[model samples]
Target: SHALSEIGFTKYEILTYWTLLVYGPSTAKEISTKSGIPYNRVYDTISSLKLRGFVTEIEGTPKVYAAYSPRIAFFRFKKELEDIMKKLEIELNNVKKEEQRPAIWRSRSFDEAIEMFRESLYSAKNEVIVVTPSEFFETIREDLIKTLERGVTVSLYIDKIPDLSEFKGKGNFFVRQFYKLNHLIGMTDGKEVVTIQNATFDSIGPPSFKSTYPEIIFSQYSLIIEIFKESTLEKEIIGNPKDIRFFAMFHAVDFVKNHLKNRNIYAEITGKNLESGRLETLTGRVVGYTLSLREAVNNIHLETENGVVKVGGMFAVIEDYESTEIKFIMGVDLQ
Candidate 1:
């Protein structure tokens, strides 16, 4: 009954058609008696069914109506419905497309929240910052390792440090333990964030919130950054040359100044020579750096086989070369 109604069949029309199919070709009076439709309504219903290709009239002294075979009638109905749908699709699509505004999504249970967190991790192109409990972190530990392998940076601010054996060789992975954390929050590339309050291992998981709005992401990122800065714990910054790539100028400068400062570091620098305007790749020890308060005054100095060479960021003019990519050889001695 429901399917028939979807194809524009009225109650009386459906009854009359079914009656004809079951009792063979039947006159209007006979159809009404068998189908429980009124005698006067059966004729109008039969005419409507005939127009829709579901019933046919046998011409004679007393006209008889028979149902078209179910297969043929349903196929005709499907074709007509598809055509209407196609026309609607085109006409509706021609109307203005909706703008893709920033949105906030909510998850109902713990499983859904963890799925949202994993999705955010996979979507990250540059960096992922996660502040989660050990229990919650275990759920997405494998995914975090995969994200790091992809050369995307992963930072974990966890309540308790889980086993680090599995994550040993994965570069671009950082972990800091925070003793007091009540909620689980993750931000990806500083663009989207997901959070679950009162995180626990209970059977009934708590609700989660995910948002792409810049304001919310900014606020959450600021909170995490503050936590990272204030905490003085056994933090780990693990990476190798394979994880190195053409990071943004600001990021490269920050990493060198903050992380690699005062350490014997070797790098394979690829960039365009300022004087010759030719691309070159040179391996050397990082000897000196000038990251000033001003933006344009940032560059690194490397000592190569010949002598010390100055490397700057993109579009360097005064420096010896403008670096496009930098790969760090951690344990190698260039002296």
Candidate 2:
């Protein structure tokens, strides 16, 4: 009865229609008497129901009205409602586009924060950078693995390295150990970020911040890189270097340069030799390098048997070869 009213049925109409359906077809006076509706009101109510397809007129000496079959009538009503809703959806979506704005969400709990973190990982297209405690990693490890499997580079920084045998052979996954993190920060595709301050394993603490604003994301990404630079423990770099994407390669330049300067590092580089325009491999010790922050120059000096060959990134023109893939061998000096 309430549902009938919601669909624009008046009380008299519902009663009259229901009475007709239960008592078989009836004339207006009989319906009015049986439904407790006034005789004058019954005709108008029945007319409205007939207009809306819920009542049908049957010819006789005194014309009778019948309630339409509930099954067919409701089905037709549903189809009409669906068509109306579809049009409304399109119009509302257009209005939303015109009023769009950047969003920043704050989560009230640890579980909520982790949910946002997982969502950010799922939305990643190019890369993911995470600086979190080991406990926080445990919560979102599967999502990170899925993101990696999708060919999005994941660079994870944590206080300790967990068992990552499951992550082996996944695409472009790098792990480093950083000590004493009190917050969880993650950036996806350099466009969105989630940050949880005072994050802890023992208890649910403060709220987490999530933002799609470019400036906020940029600052968070810079923080992740700073954490990466401060982390001294390099657990592993998984996947083939030759297939590394440009963004991952660019972010890794400083880390690789740091290792080469402080440790005995050798590189196995595969790319096209610029002068010959033929595919080749350059195996050499990393003798020197140059990184120009102002001009955005990052070039590695590799000393091969032929002498020192200069290696650059994807768009290298001034260097000897633009390296397509690069793998570094750390601590090779034995004396």
Candidate 3:
């Protein structure tokens, strides 16, 4: 295709013209000697150049061979570059929707990203699907509570968490335990999916809890945020595994400090998600505290670096949720 000048000029034409430009005029002999084109064929080349208006003659000695202005030739080159760019743009769009790719969300830090996820979960319309097994231990109890308030249906598959039927029907608790945990991600008003994983939190100050906000896609709030999970739904999660529907997380303080390169944003690293995990604030700071989950799951223990991460009221307990109406008479080890 490059041989054809659907693009204006052939390769031979370019070579021959540049040759004249470099060696200039000196009869056919001068052009053949300097450009390495055969002397015998040089006459034919000079005749072609004259017809194309690239060269002019002089009476005797060394008849000069000079080229026209480069700017004039460049007009054609400019058109070619433009066509190449257009072809590339069309190819890029066909790769698929931009959302399916690794997306980057710019925020202040890890804490801010968590805050964003929590808010998204709580404000979900009609339905919220959770795929994390650990969260079944009531880790996101607070976020779940808010979601239910909007009458959102929460369906979840948790890792073998202990039974947590005690907190059912308390205000906003709609999660039904599937007694299953797979790394499957599922969240959407039947459209979008959000997944979070391997997130880091900020330790600069206390954490914030019970966050509330007006629902909109880009209403920016001052909080910690990060990106760690691969946002997707096309992957598969094998047996005895729970799929995380919409996963998202960030490195709380450390990740934030390193990523949000703006000094002004760094200064806003002041609050966090509170410990009680109940949307409460201490002064202007949000606290990150530990929560209990011993009776929250079945045979599953809350494991973390220091026992369980200090989070409370961050989850909701829906009794006999997916597996409802069970009667256990005698004393039995539920765990």
Colliding pairs, model 2: 242-325
Each model's backbone clash number: 0, 1, 70
Candidate 2 lDDT, tens digit per residue, 1-335? 22233323443454555434332333222343343332234456566566667657677565555665667656776787888988986797577654347789998777888878887888676667788877677778889888888777777788877898887787777777887787888877556789876554346555687987867765665566567556865655546444443243345465566566556767777777888888888888878887775565677788898899888765567788876366665653352
- Candidates in order have lDDT scores of 0.67, 0.67, 0.35
TM-score of each: 0.49, 0.49, 0.26
Runs with alpha carbons beyond 4 Å of true place in candidate 3: 1-110, 135-137, 170-186, 199-335
Candidate 2 off by > 4 Å: 1-100, 198-206, 246-250, 255-289, 292-335
* Per-candidate alpha-carbon RMSD to the true structure: 12.1, 12.0, 21.9
On lDDT, who's better, 2 or 3?
2
State, as a TM-score between 0 and 1, how close model 3 is to the true structure: 0.26
